[PDB]
Design a protein around this ligand. Structure first.
Ligand SMILES: NC(=O)C1=CN([C@@H]2O[C@H](COP(=O)(O)OP(=O)(O)OC[C@H]3O[C@@H](n4cnc5c(N)ncnc54)[C@H](O)[C@@H]3O)[C@@H](O)[C@H]2O)[C@@H](O)CC1
Ligand SMILES: NC(=O)C1=CN([C@@H]2O[C@H](COP(=O)(O)OP(=O)(O)OC[C@H]3O[C@@H](n4cnc5c(N)ncnc54)[C@H](O)[C@@H]3O)[C@@H](O)[C@H]2O)[C@@H](O)CC1
Ligand SMILES: NC(=O)C1=CN([C@@H]2O[C@H](COP(=O)(O)OP(=O)(O)OC[C@H]3O[C@@H](n4cnc5c(N)ncnc54)[C@H](O)[C@@H]3O)[C@@H](O)[C@H]2O)[C@@H](O)CC1
Ligand SMILES: NC(=O)C1=CN([C@@H]2O[C@H](COP(=O)(O)OP(=O)(O)OC[C@H]3O[C@@H](n4cnc5c(N)ncnc54)[C@H](O)[C@@H]3O)[C@@H](O)[C@H]2O)[C@@H](O)CC1
Ligand SMILES: Nc1ncnc2c1ncn2[C@@H]1O[C@H](COP(=O)(O)O)[C@@H](O)[C@H]1O
Ligand SMILES: Nc1ncnc2c1ncn2[C@@H]1O[C@H](COP(=O)(O)O)[C@@H](O)[C@H]1O
Ligand SMILES: Nc1ncnc2c1ncn2[C@@H]1O[C@H](COP(=O)(O)O)[C@@H](O)[C@H]1O
Ligand SMILES: Nc1ncnc2c1ncn2[C@@H]1O[C@H](COP(=O)(O)O)[C@@H](O)[C@H]1O
Ligand SMILES: [Mg+2]
Ligand SMILES: [Mg+2]
Ligand SMILES: [Mg+2]
Ligand SMILES: [Mg+2]
Lengths: 277, 277, 277, 277
């Protein structure tokens, strides 16, 4: 009904960054990921791999003590802020980060919202997903706030029932991005990327291989990394959603859509990303 | 002697499900796996990988605290019900699952049977394997009960000695599926899939590469996942047994039958499944 | 000086076993591996992978509590006898095994020799390696005892200095196999396989890619598995040593000899073994 | 301005060692790596893999108790000196090593400098990286001391600000190698390898795929291993830096430069090294 344009291959090619010969890890920044809890530890690994695969310089993972050891053998490149997501509830961050994500595998609690409020006082883009998504408002700040709800989380945020939401996805996503003054990545087939300045796009990539636990955790990480290597954070969000879906399309060329595991999207991204360079 | 028909490539092709563009993980359900104990932890990873590879939406693994960390780095997509198989002995499940499996790597104890009795009060298909297999009867309930004995476990269930069983496999499997009113997947070369309504099939795939620890644990998981994406639970069971054996046949094209490890069946399934689409 | 014959490709092809369609894991037996200690845990994983890759039915790993979790994510198919190598020092094994190995990554202590003495009362082939190798004698028993010393361990066993040993390898290996009434696999370039009945062979495969920590741990496991699927335990030993070296030769076709890691021999064996079928 | 020559493909080919048929792990020595701490554990795995991939015989990793289990499943070939880097602060090493590295993932503390002072009393080449880099002087000793600073660490060592350093990299690196009487590998695009005898080279390989956490940790390990298989420790340093960068160039043929993870350099080295033989 709205004619929201697709973010196309041509837009991706035109906007993906270079990685210059004269750069070091500091050029691409240090990200922070606040993710993973004792009965949902895997979401931290998924998002971690997503982020380190996606062109950042360094990654600090703020997760519980019990989760740390489960990440290290698979993602040895990350370092840790021990019990970081709980510690973020107590004070403003003393360290400076290029971008921050919070929520995958975190309980949807008031302590998590406190950590959200502290993270928002930093001057960098911030992603809120999963356990960090709630019905709330957002303080005026410099850097973008990026919310990544699936339709269930959108219902939690807005009170718009899922059955109604799904009939008018882009209309609701635009309306709430504007009201909240946040980016909203409203997930699903034809994911909507709605910006608080009124720009809105649809994502043309992805398939049912993504309809399985963990794929959104991986996406949150991909957005986190891309925010560190793109000059324009809009392009980071758009390219992460696009390339995330493109990795699922590569998988289905020679593998059944029923059989993808989320972490494999990260394994596939190196070759898919190269295609768009 | 009986002319039990084979479930053939043509039957598999005709019955494997689609994964629609307009679906999400909830479309394919949340399964529960109750598996893994302190000296047999690996069976939980094997069955977990089997299940997540096999087209479910989400997987919760109910296993002991000591087993959880051993699964997460390999299968980060699963979440946990901490000490779940022990907790299931104490009360009906409060959560709703699309399908449930119990038994791989569990001790063959009365506490495990209590957990079985509680799981059976849910309205979903239930698989019982390994430590959950015992001589018993089953309450009338809506969803199918699927027993996956090898010949030793069948002897434990029925008192039919293995030497006698193996002379008349389909006859015994049919007789006991009918008596018990359960599906029986009687494993071995030419696995028998006997339904309590009298339908019975033989499986034509598989080889001696499967004659090694863990392959039945992986199968239980494959059945669990397929029950979540097939509309007809009969087809889920049949296709899981078939594709399980087909992965062993792919392996032996270029690898010795002596050298397969069970977890690799799960790694092979993506490409094998695609062949049948 | 002696004309000890090489165990050749033709001997390997003539002696490798079939894996029949009508077999199950019990056909190929349950092996026991007593290996791994707190500061040398990896040797248990190396030998475990070697063994499960090499055609056994099941593998029980008797290792310390702290080592168990380090094996499970990589080799989920093994089960455990918790603190098994220490417990073996206290009594004869109550369980029956198709073959047993002891020593990789175990401290060279009197407690380990006690565990050796208990294992020797079983009726199955037994391999002694590494920490289980000492200067001693062996009781008359039914099954073969297989010692796998490198030249340093041979010096420890016999008092023959390494410099002298290495001038007359097959002569010393034969002499001591006869004296001890054990098989001796005297490792090195042109490994000597000396039988206590006077048969003796040289191994023609392998290269300097093997000259790195862990490769002998992997070999001990390969011998353990092959003893379970070969009818003649002589052929098991000969084929394990041969195929172990052949995997290093495959590696060097496209990879530098400086860069092999022991666990990769196990990864390579599936395709190498197939070549000899 | 200086015409520092590049260490070229031809120099690498002329200087890489053979791995003779008549060698064993002892021929290539035992290295010691003192690396990894509770919130930076991964650096020990990265450097460990680097080292074992790079032609040593054995590797002992001296790291904290909590780090050990995180390494073993990925690098089972290493053994451990439990809490080794802390224990090295208390006394001269009783064991003899072919080469030693210290610092990746270690806190930059006085206790680490004490461990440095003890390691320096050994007669072998010693690498100091990361947490072991400080403003200090070095005792006259037989074996080379090899410092591997990035420009930030060089500033910490010398007081030369990074902005000034980067205008005259080889001039500063030569000056300080001479003053300190240490090798300095001054990292960055066109890494400078400055020897205390006045030889100096530039490295022509590498790209922005390396501009991400962990790649320097992997390099320290590669240098450690190469010091064990090269007769001339100068060639070890030069070839490690060259081949490290070459692995990043192989990656970018078919993968985006944004997406490399440090541990993958180690995975790539087997095939890259073979190219130069
Ligand atoms: N491996 C892990 O550690 C995992 C952790 N996860 C975490 O589990 C927590 C809960 O998130 P979940 O998303 O699993 O569960 P939720 O219960 O929050 O949301 C799922 C529900 O949202 C609705 N929904 C979602 N997508 C929809 C669509 N396209 N159309 C219509 N309705 C839709 C449905 O009502 C569905 O039942 C989060 O913290 C998440 O990060 C999940 O990602 C699963 C994997
Ligand atoms: N990695 C792990 O954690 C593993 C766990 N496992 C668990 O170990 C427990 C015991 O199960 P097992 O099956 O190992 O041992 P069992 O002792 O229960 O059954 C094996 C016996 O059954 C008979 N049998 C099985 N298949 C046969 C056939 N085709 N023909 C004739 N006789 C046959 C034989 O008597 C054989 O000795 C289960 O909980 C199982 O899930 C096993 O799957 C081994 C791997
Ligand atoms: N990843 C792990 O957990 C590892 C554990 N390992 C364990 O470490 C223990 C000690 O065994 P090691 O072999 O490392 O050390 P040892 O000190 O027992 O033996 C090595 C010595 O034997 C001699 N030697 C060996 N091969 C020779 C040859 N071809 N020619 C001449 N001399 C030769 C040399 O004197 C050499 O220094 C064992 O329990 C072993 O299983 C080792 O395999 C290293 C890897
Ligand atoms: N996975 C892990 O366990 C990791 C551990 N690491 C450890 O973290 C510790 C701190 O080392 P880091 O290097 O991360 O952080 P540092 O804060 O010590 O050094 C980074 C700073 O040095 C400067 N710098 C570095 N390279 C430069 C170049 N080419 N041009 C200009 N300026 C440059 C910049 O000021 C930059 O902010 C070390 O012990 C290191 O081994 C890091 O390697 C990150 C990964
Ligand atoms: N059928 C589908 N087609 C395209 N994308 C999908 C489909 N199912 C799920 N996804 C994507 O998978 C992710 C699910 O996120 P989450 O539910 O948070 O794990 C989102 O990026 C979705 O847009
Ligand atoms: N020789 C064989 N041919 C075909 N399938 C086999 C063979 N040996 C074992 N299997 C299969 O491997 C699995 C063994 O299950 P379990 O004993 O529970 O681990 C079952 O699915 C068997 O049907
Ligand atoms: N240069 C070489 N050529 C052939 N085999 C080797 C060589 N170096 C080591 N090996 C083999 O590697 C293993 C070393 O055993 P160990 O020292 O116990 O780890 C043995 O099987 C040796 O025969
Ligand atoms: N843009 C680049 N080109 C070449 N090498 C690089 C580049 N960025 C980083 N490196 C290398 O990556 C490593 C970084 O080390 P560190 O900062 O200690 O992790 C060094 O070996 C650098 O020389
Ligand atoms: Mg989500
Ligand atoms: Mg079973
Ligand atoms: Mg050895
Ligand atoms: Mg560094």
């Amino acid at each position: 009904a709205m004619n929201v344009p697709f973010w196309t291959e041509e837009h991706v090619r035109a906007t993906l960054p270079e990685r210059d010969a004269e750069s070091h890890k500091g050029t691409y920044g240090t990200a922070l990921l606040l993710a993973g809890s004792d009965d949902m530890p895997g979401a931290a690994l998924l998002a971690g791999l997503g982020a380190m695969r996606s062109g950042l310089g360094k990654l600090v993972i703020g997760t519980s003590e019990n989760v740390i050891p489960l990440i290290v053998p698979v993602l040895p490149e990350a370092t840790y802020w021990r019990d970081g997501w709980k510690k973020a509830a107590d004070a403003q961050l003393e360290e400076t980060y290029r971008a921050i994500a919070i929520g995958p595998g975190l309980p949807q609690t008031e302590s998590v919202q406190q950590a959200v409020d502290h993270v928002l006082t930093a001057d960098c883009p911030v992603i809120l997903d999963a356990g960090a998504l709630a019905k709330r408002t957002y303080p005026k700040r410099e850097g973008p706030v990026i919310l990544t709800p699936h339709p269930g989380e959108f219902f939690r945020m807005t009170g718009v029932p899922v059955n109604e939401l799904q009939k008018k996805r882009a209309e609701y996503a635009k309306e709430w991005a504007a009201q909240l003054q946040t980016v909203i990545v409203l997930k699903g087939n034809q994911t909507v990327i709605a910006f608080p300045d009124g720009d809105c796009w649809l994502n043309p990539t992805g398939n049912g291989a993504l309809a399985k636990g963990g794929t959104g955790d991986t996406l949150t990480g991909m957005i986190l990394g891309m925010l560190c290597c793109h000059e324009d954070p809009k392009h980071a969000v758009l390219n992460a959603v696009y390339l995330h879906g493109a990795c699922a399309e590569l998988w289905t060329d020679e593998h059944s859509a029923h059989t993808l595991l989320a972490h494999e999207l990260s394994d596939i991204l190196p070759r898919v990303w190269k295609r768009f360079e």
